[PDB]
Design a protein around this ligand. Structure first.
Ligand SMILES: Cc1ncc(COP(=O)(O)O)c(CNCC(=O)O)c1O
Ligand SMILES: Cc1ncc(COP(=O)(O)O)c(CNCC(=O)O)c1O
Ligand SMILES: Cc1ncc(COP(=O)(O)O)c(CNCC(=O)O)c1O
Ligand SMILES: Cc1ncc(COP(=O)(O)O)c(CNCC(=O)O)c1O
Lengths: 462, 463, 463, 462
């Protein structure tokens, strides 16, 4: 036989090497810019971030840390990771004498589990926001039947705290009481579907009374934190973890911030740095994904610009404006508003489940996600970061609410005519002219705005 | 006021971030103007890189194709389904007997997800000892008892070793340890083992002691796909792998698992699929990195080509030719040869440590890595995949051996002139004309070959 | 030369070891010349003591009757079989529905053996909080998170509490915690709880959350045998107990477990017997203490007599009469009374701590113990079994309350005169004529009654 | 109704209160003095020990330690426990500045598990002598199938070391190699059926090379240790646990010895005392069994007498003399002799199992126990302490060997005539005149010697 020439296999563009995958990426590109993307955890990152993500940085193995690698060839990888770490501190206004950061986690879930491994022993106790109350899997999750779902609940001992059953706010009194009975070694704040800000000072007061470490998972609001538009968890938390692909508008990666230097009121100093770095490598991960680190460095510089602070301001205002429109139609929002990037829409007063609204919205190129509410999820979660990154403002998000209003009206019209069971409901989705009209208006409205990451003019499917 | 989308979102990297753009360009030159001999490294294709840097990074798709948590996944599902079916085809697996999860972020997440699926916390694991060629994720604790690897933190690990004299895996001591220790899981595969694995013997040991058998084929997965080494799928219950080494894809992981009827209690069937998929999500990971999955799908298509089988053949032949050249100069290789992509070079007969040779080689743009040998590591590990991907053949790898020979000769001259201690050795690296002469010859030799992934002609830093 | 058997082996203790003989004689006088109010203490019979000190201590008999590891157990087997059948008869249990293991060395080994039988390491357990009246073996960790009890070291425990105002068990907060925490095992029973237990409600909570239900009836086992309190066998899967408290036997433990068909998946039967017996031996214990088993068999026969049911009735009536007397003086009892063998005396309304009252009472040969109350413990626990075994009735226990009243009065006089701090309090104990006067009145009152276990007439230290 | 008077229920002798149990104790008393007791773990303790064991000390609750109890009334209990501890140190020639002891363990298995809990965390690694090689359950045991039997193997991670497959001695080279692969936190020496002395110095050399603590379980030879007739484990071990009812000839209890004071070649001191005491109480046990502690104090004083050192010398000589007689008949002993209180008799060369010899011996009032040998146990374990306590010397133990020789001859005669299967073998035990003749000669021989603990003249069944 004969080996392929480098020019054939190694330099030929994707559109020629693999038409199938190229065609599917092009279809996904159109889907992203011809619908309304309301997944609260999604964003549209920049072309610059994407160019660093798709680069020769993927070829380099660089196990270890800058200045203490396991092998050579890391002269420029070290500068990239050092730039990424220093830019990570600048984006969140942290002094390098009081804070450090590890930028090697592959994603948010590796970042959280590495933080747990660093400061906790197996079976140590952890408290996190309950999933039906707005928490995340990695904060601990086991079912009513006792089945341990999350790895946090498998390798550690978790116990959730809940929001108030009626107001929807975090019950800080019941949080403190459970923390005193349970005595966790680590308390986690932050969540995935909580529509209000966090009282980190009260969390610090509870952690000090029970003797726990305080960690904040700011994955969802990290972009708002960098722009100083929400409460800063660094004022009170020992460790802060985050994703970088949500409101921060970067690549899919994770970071772990940790305190260093003198402790607040012997002459004790913090002992997190070595534990956190060792937990990431050599304990849990292998070689870093340097293409993610380089792309993250780009995203962190953009997050420090004045234009980004205006983006975070706009995300909050769009979420509020959208929430005001929905409540003006009589709809119920958890806590009756929002202070961040998302709204949590209670659908139980309409006799609807999140599944039905999400399915019909998806048929209209409106991507939301069903989400549990306090108490077959009875709500949908709606986020503003992604569509705001396309340039939408308050008036545009009121139009989104109008589309959502039309979609729920069609959901109720279908349910009233065919039935409450899924098999009955599905009958109304086949050959529905009103759905096809709603999708047409979404598509035309979505095409009105720009799209970052790629050029619509160069798209395959226009 | 918000920035216009065209300004922040569509502007090329070279304008948005000159600092990072310049550093990527410098790393591009380093990759194509030196000799890359890290056995775990490769140079992937531009096609893989174009899929890696694409709008697929924007999509959240928690769950599995056909079983997602939310919508918008019409095209993501087809990409992951294509990736899974191409993974089975690339390794010649029947879909009724094998399944695969392609969501692991990397190789270490892939191994820990497999452990979580089939093991309870503190269950016992046996893996190849690190000084014998093993990997961290197979278990590692220090002399003091400090648990380094997460495998040794959340599970109970015990290593097995190569034969103290031959350097081959001691299958007799493996079986003896397996019966004393009674592991629930035995791991085969390694990072610096220069021979093939007897998976049939591992199955005999696993059946005698009652353990599951997992193979971590990360390093030789490309050779396995091309059927140039023994296939672990013939005997192992689970096969994990990276996709960025000899497979020449993006940085990702996969978990292969058996399906269907068991081989001779009743008509029992395998029970791995649901446990493995659940362990990846929702247990350990969050949303998959769909840009990795799409790039992996491209890599798996390329791995099924006739050109890739010829590449795997060439990697093996280059490793032999390099090893044959080194032994002709009197140097010592562990097991006295190789049957895969790498050679393990024993430096103790020369009175050298792996640290010194690696440091001087790096000053000449020759990237190797110090590596423990059976027993301050006394060896260096050298791999053929990366330079073979640039088009080098046997004669070119014999010149690489000449460069290595020159480097070790300079290392001994420094040690004889300044001393055996590292601080003494460093004195010989300051303003060394012979090192700078070797660096110049490496650069000129490296510039002779093509480079996948990007165009050398469009590089920022020329010559 | 070896000593003759008659010299070392047959000589009485009074000659072999005068030092220890003298100390036992002094302890004999202390036991019958003071007021013993430790709720967990009793005075067992001479018959029990004769079996306890017998040649049964010489026999090794690892295993179970009819399933031993070696021979010579013809008579040991009959003794253990008698002990087991008498254990079921004493608590009115059908042998087809209940079994019992009588080999635990004490109560704490009995509880930990039950945990080992039905739980895996780190499984979750709920037990009565120590400040609410619980016991160490039900789980205990400090404010700092330090795991004190072995139950909290090898398992994951979480306490439930009494109502903050009434002092009764908060069954609503119990169920709420059981659903959040999801324990595999819920423990009922306690050491200082002055009311009866609603085992039916515990069964409803255990069934709703999916837990096993165990009762530790150590303190009230004598009252249970005489059917003077609620029976935990009606609702619990497992019942553990000591045998030296209200049961008035030797220091040993037992584990009762359900057998036979389950109450309404299929025709399921209980699976406790083999797990519990295996947990005791060979898992946790070695050879049983057959002298304890023989003495226990004697105690269980005595516990089945009509005289024992009258003793249990009297213990309850004495506790009420003592508590009624204390409340007539204005003192505060937790839950304002009792339904069992003890009273829990709240001293915080008097501005006193349990430590001070216990110290002054001990100087007067009145043995109580400081005990936490809901919330430097602010209470003392007082029990009726021991003094009731000496023949005291209600009028005699009202005199005991008068002694306690005098003791607390002296405690307050010292605190008012010297101070609230412990170092201040100690100043009032030096050469206190009122304390010495109270001690004299306790001695004269204590000498009025008989004493089981030994003959007061043959004591070494008379008067 | 009416309560029983104290004189009736509380002062009446056992023979009247419970004739059934009294009759069974009397039958057990005769069985003990009219047969040959060769269970290596059994002894006959003194009447003085028994009088302290059966005393009013059983009525006292005394949770805690002397000088730091939880409640009052402990003036005399404290003196008894303090006497017991100081006598424990004297019996083993320990300086109180270098060694402490806790005398509260209920038995040997509680003593070992309390020591493990004190110095180890759950799932820490332990190495102990394999059961087929002469080890004990509490040192760790899991089956070939992987079933975890011992609580040591359930709550900790155990791995056994073995004797040499041919010589029967401990393989110290393979011990060191396994310790270096496995890296235990605790190494246990001592065993239940090992017929030779221990090289504690080599055990210390292995423990120091791998970084482990060294514990000796001297339960079986504790009497020989007190009399300084075998190697002392205190010279090299960090912790020493023991029972008190075997060769020490005391009550059924346990003790934990631990090092204190300056360490051997900073100015570090030992940290065992607080950990060991806390593990016993409040961690694992409740109130001490003060009747056991008082009886133990008596036994420890007797163990310090010159008569006891002569007893330990005689136990060793009786075991050797018995072993010499058996080997003179062609029988096989593990390691071909003994250096302590027992012999391990290999029955496989005779085509016999331990079950058959033990069953036939038991029918002749000869109590041995089947015991695994290196490799359906193929051996029997025979001990000298109990019969030596009755005054038997070398000539008497050669008569025991003659009885054992006759018993095995009858076992082979039965097996040759009826078969190797248990059902075949049992046929030869029914109405066997030779067995009844052997039992008659054992009974007459056993009646020739005295019996401690009780007066044969006062027995019920003579
Ligand atoms: C055999 C093996 N398995 C798993 C991994 C982990 O892969 P990730 O870095 O993607 O987590 C490695 C990395 N081996 C790196 C080397 O030999 O240089 C490996 O060699
Ligand atoms: C608060 C939080 N933390 C961690 C993660 C995990 O991130 P990765 O998927 O990169 O592992 C998520 C994902 N949240 C997904 C969602 O809300 O839709 C999250 O919401
Ligand atoms: C060495 C050793 N250690 C501890 C124990 C346990 O002692 P207790 O039974 O008191 O728990 C034994 C019992 N050995 C019993 C035998 O060899 O027959 C033992 O032999
Ligand atoms: C309810 C309960 N359970 C178990 C135990 C332990 O029993 P042992 O001491 O035999 O291990 C106790 C001791 N309670 C002691 C007291 O209340 O004073 C107890 O009160």
């Amino acid at each position: 036989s004969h080996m392929d020439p480098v020019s054939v296999w190694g330099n030929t563009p994707l559109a020629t090497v693999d038409p199938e995958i190229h065609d599917l990426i092009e279809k996904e590109k159109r889907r992203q810019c011809r619908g309304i993307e309301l997944i609260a955890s999604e964003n549209f990152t920049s072309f610059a971030v994407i160019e660093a993500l798709g680069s020769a940085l993927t070829n380099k193995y660089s196990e270890g840390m800058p200045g203490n690698r396991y092998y050579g060839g890391n002269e420029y990888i070290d500068q990239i990771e050092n730039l990424c770490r220093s830019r990570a501190l600048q984006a969140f206004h942290l002094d390098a004498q009081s804070w450090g950061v590890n930028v090697q986690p592959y994603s948010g879930s590796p970042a959280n589990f590495a933080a747990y491994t660093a400061v906790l022993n197996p079976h140590d106790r952890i408290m996190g926001l309950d999933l039906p109350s707005g928490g995340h899997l990695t904060h601990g999750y086991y079912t009513s039947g006792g089945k341990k779902i999350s790895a946090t609940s498998i390798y550690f001992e978790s116990l959730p705290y809940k929001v108030n059953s009626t107001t929807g706010y975090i019950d800080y009194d019941r949080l403190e009481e459970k923390a005193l009975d349970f005595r966790p070694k680590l308390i986690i704040c932050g969540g995935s579907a909580y529509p209000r800000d966090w009282d980190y000072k009260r969390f610090r007061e509870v952690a000090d009374k029970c003797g726990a470490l305080l960690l904040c998972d700011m994955a969802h609001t990290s972009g708002l934190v960098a722009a100083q538009e929400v409460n800063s968890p660094f004022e009170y938390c020992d460790i802060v973890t985050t994703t970088t692909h949500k409101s921060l508008r970067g690549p899919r990666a994770g970071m772990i911030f940790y305190r260093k230097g003198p402790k607040p009121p012997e002459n004790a100093v913090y002992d997190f740095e070595d534990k956190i770095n060792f937990a990431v490598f050599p304990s849990l991960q292998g070689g870093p994904h340097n293409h993610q680190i380089g792309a993250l460095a780009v995203a962190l510089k953009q997050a420090a610009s004045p234009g980004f602070k205006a983006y975070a301001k706009q995300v909050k205002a769009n979420a509020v404006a959208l929430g005001k429109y929905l409540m003006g139609k009589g709809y119920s929002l958890v806590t009756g508003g929002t202070e961040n990037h998302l709204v949590l829409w209670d659908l139980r007063p309409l006799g609807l489940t999140g599944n039905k609204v999400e399915k019909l919205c998806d048929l209209c190129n409106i991507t939301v996600n069903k989400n549990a509410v306090f108490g077959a999820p009875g709500g949908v979660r709606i986020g503003a970061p992604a569509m705001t990154s396309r340039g939408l403002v308050e008036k545009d998000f009121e139009q989104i609410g109008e589309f959502l209003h039309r979609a729920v009206t069609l959901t109720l019209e279908i349910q009233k005519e065919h039935g409450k069971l899924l098999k009955d409901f599905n009958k109304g989705l086949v050959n529905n002219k009103a759905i096809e009209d709603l999708k047409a208006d979404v598509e035309k409205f979505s095409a009105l705005f720009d799209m970052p990451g790629f050029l619509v003019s160069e798209m395959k499917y226009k």
